[PDB]
Structure formats: C-alpha cells, structure tokens
Amino acid sequence: IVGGYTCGANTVPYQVSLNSGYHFCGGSLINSQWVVSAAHCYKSGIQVRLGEDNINVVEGNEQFISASKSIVHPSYNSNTLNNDIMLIKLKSAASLNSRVASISLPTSCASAGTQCLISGWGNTKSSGTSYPDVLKCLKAPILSDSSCKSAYPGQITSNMFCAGYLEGGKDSCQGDSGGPVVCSGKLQGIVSWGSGCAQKNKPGVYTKVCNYVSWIKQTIASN
Numbered sequence: 080i081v082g083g084y085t086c087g088a089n090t091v092p093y094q095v096s097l098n099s100g101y102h103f104c105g106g107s108l109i110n111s112q113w114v115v116s117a118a119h120c121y122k123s124g125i126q127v128r129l130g131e132d133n134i135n136v137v138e139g140n141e142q143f144i145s146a147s148k149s150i151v152h153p154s155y156n157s158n159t160l161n162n163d164i165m166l167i168k169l170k171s172a173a174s175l176n177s178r179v180a181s182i183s184l185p186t187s188c189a190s191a192g193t194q195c196l197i198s199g200w201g202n203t204k205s206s207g208t209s210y211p212d213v214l215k216c217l218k219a220p221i222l223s224d225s226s227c228k229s230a231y232p233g234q235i236t237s238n239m240f241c242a243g244y245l246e247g248g249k250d251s252c253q254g255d256s257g258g259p260v261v262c263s264g265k266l267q268g269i270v271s272w273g274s275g276c277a278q279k280n281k282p283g284v285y286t287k288v289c290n291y292v293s294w295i296k297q298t299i300a301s302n
C-alpha cells in the first residue's frame with residue numbers, strides 16, 4: 080500500500096497473509112474454511128496466516144493453517160488477467176473470534192464513487208521497494224467505468240473495476256495482490272493489477288467480485 084496508514088492491530092480481521100517462507104500475497108477469509116485471493120497468487124506449498132499484524136513477529140492471535148487445495152478460476156487468463164480469482168480451502172477450520180472473522184460476499188455490485196477499504200503488506204513505495212512489518216490501510220473510491228477504460232484502453236473487461244486516485248500517490252502495490260477491497264461491509268474487489276504503483280492517471284485495477292458470487296458458492300458447495 081502506497082500513501083496509506085497503519086491500520087491498527089487486528090482492525091481488519093478478515094485479512095490473511097499467504098506465506099511460503101515469506102509473505103507473497105493477501106487474501107480474505109469468507110468462512111471458517113475458505114479464503115478468496117487472486118489467481119496470479121497461485122503456487123504450491125501455501126500456508127495461510129490469520130490474525131496477523133506484524134508478519135515478522137509472533138505477537139499472539141495468529142493462526143497458521145496449511146492450504147489443502149487451491150482452486151484457480153478455470154477461465155483465468157494469465158495474459159489479460161481476466162477472471163483473476165482463486166479459492167483456497169484450509170486444511171482445518173479456523174477458530175473465529177474478534178481478531179479473526181470472515182467478510183461477507185456482496186449481493187449487488189458497487190457503484191462508482193463508493194468508498195472502500197484496501198489493505199495489505201505490499202510495497203509502500205512508488206519508486207523503489209519497502210515492505211512494512213504491520214498491516215497498511217487505504218481508503219479509496221471506485222472510479223467510473225469510463226475513467227477506468229480511458230486510463231487502460233482495451234484492457235478492462237466486465238470483470239474488472241478501477242479504484243484509487245488519478246493524481247497518484249495512493250494505491251495498492253505488489254504484495255497487496257489477492258487482498259481485499261471492502262465497501263460497506265462487503266467484499267467487492269480483489270487486488271489484481273495496475274501500471275506501476277501510485278502513478279498519476281494509472282489507478283489500481285481490481286477483480287469485480289460481485290460477478291463471481293454464484294461461482295464461489297457453487298464451487299465451495301461441491302468441495
């Protein structure tokens with residue numbers, strides 16, 4: 080997260096860190112046994128870490144659970160990043176409490192102008208590399224479809240939406256990938272891609288979760 084603020088320990092209870100000997104992606108807990116992340120975060124040997132704040136120090140409240148299976152959307156395209164969504168089933172159910180809780184899936188899509196909360200342990204610098212120890216937060220609005228497409232001509236599909244600031248200085252970044260974009264208590268997006276980080280006229284692009292609610296429910300029900 081570039082230009083954000085320190086969230087505060089466990090203030091984003093549904094935020095998870097995907098770990099393989101180091102933090103490489105974010106994710107969102109949607110129920111005691113399932114996590115939603117981005118398809119480009121796929122890889123073997125994933126350990127899901129819940130209840131985290133400082134990812135380099137065991138402070139308490141953390142729960143480390145191995146992923147039993149990762150399900151990348153069958154139509155995910157690694158070139159266009161269309162359908163950039165993946166479901167992760169936990170080996171064992173997480174213990175839900177005030178520090179570890181699930182986030183609700185949307186019933187309807189969000190409209191432009193809606194204010195959302197984006198969070199993660201990704202890079203905090205637009206020009207350079209600087210990973211934080213604690214969780215960072217950023218409040219950003221969903222942009223209009225016309226502004227999104229004018230910013231990324233011919234690269235925005237119906238399964239994506241832009242959120243952020245056209246002036247630059249505030250945006251999600253590498254490492255935040257797969258993380259949550261929550262608006263009015265609902266998971267509306269997944270950190271997917273963008274051109275650089277926090278560059279002017281280049282807002283972040285996110286997977287539009289409301290288009291996948293039925294797929295998520297049907298997939299979870301059969302696994």
Ligand SMILES: C[C@H](NCc1cc(C(=N)N)ccc1O)C(=O)O
Nearest residue numbers: 251253256271272273275276283
């Ligand atoms: C570095 C590049 N990822 C870039 C990237 C950019 C943004 C953004 N600017 N909002 C968000 C998530 C990302 O994963 C990559 O995966 O190669």
Ligand SMILES: [Ca+2]
Nearest residue numbers: 133136137138
């Ligand atoms: Ca920790």
Ligand SMILES: [Cu+2]
Nearest residue numbers: 253256271272
């Ligand atoms: Cu990326």
